Amino acid sequence: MTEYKLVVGAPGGKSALTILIQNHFVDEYPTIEDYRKQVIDGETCLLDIDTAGSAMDQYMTGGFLCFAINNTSEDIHQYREQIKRVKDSDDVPMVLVGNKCDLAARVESRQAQDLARSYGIPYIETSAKTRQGVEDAFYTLVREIQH
């Protein structure tokens, strides 16, 4: 079976979201080679999923998941350009995820969606406490991988 190998960004909830496999919210503190899960729109697939926040180029075999909106975590741009180095390609399947859209004092969503447009990818807001958007990420990245 097809292997949906897809988590990246700055330091500050990349884990929590992936913690889809665990259906529960970590407020706790593992972040290095860290998941597998057995359908999406009726196609039966496995996933290989979490990076921490130099050369470990090594791992980006990869779709990319790639900030949490109370933090103007500029840093996405960086990630995205390091992958265009290794991957060597101006299009690689990918989702811009704004996490922690639950919280009050926050990044106004437009900003992002206009960068999103400027890379030409998904932009999906998301929240591992409330679940709101957890899987919306993952599952639109798969469907990408038309690629």
Secondary structure letter of residue 14 according to DSSP: H
Piece of 9-17, 48-56, 75-83, 106-114 that binds its own copies (CB under 8 A):
106-114
The verdict on whether residue 130 carries a ligand-binding annotation is no
Number of DSSP helices (H) and strands (E) in the chain, helices first: 4, 6
Q: Which one of 27, 33, 41, 90 is in contact with its own copies (CB under 8 A)?
A: 41
**In the complex with ligand CAG, which residue's Cβ is closer, 69 or 118?**
69
CB of 109 to its own copies, least distance (A): 3
**β pairing state of 46-48 and 36-37:** antiparallel
DSSP H helices, the chain, are 14-18, 75-86, 109-119, 134-144
**In the complex with ligand CAG, which residue's Cβ is closer, 80 or 100?**
100
Give yes or no for residue 143 binding its own copies (CB under 8 A).
yes
CB of 71 to ligand CAG, least distance (A): 10
Q: 130 and 136 in contact (C-beta within 8 Å)?
A: no
A 10 A CB-CB count for 127 gives 21
Distance CA 111, CA 50 (A): 26
Q: Which residues sit at the interface with its own copies, rule CB under 8 A? A: 41-43, 69, 98, 101, 109-110, 113, 116-117, 120, 122-125, 133, 136, 139-140, 143, 146
Query: Annotated binding site for GTP, which residues?
Result: 12-16, 26-31, 52-53, 99-102, 127-129
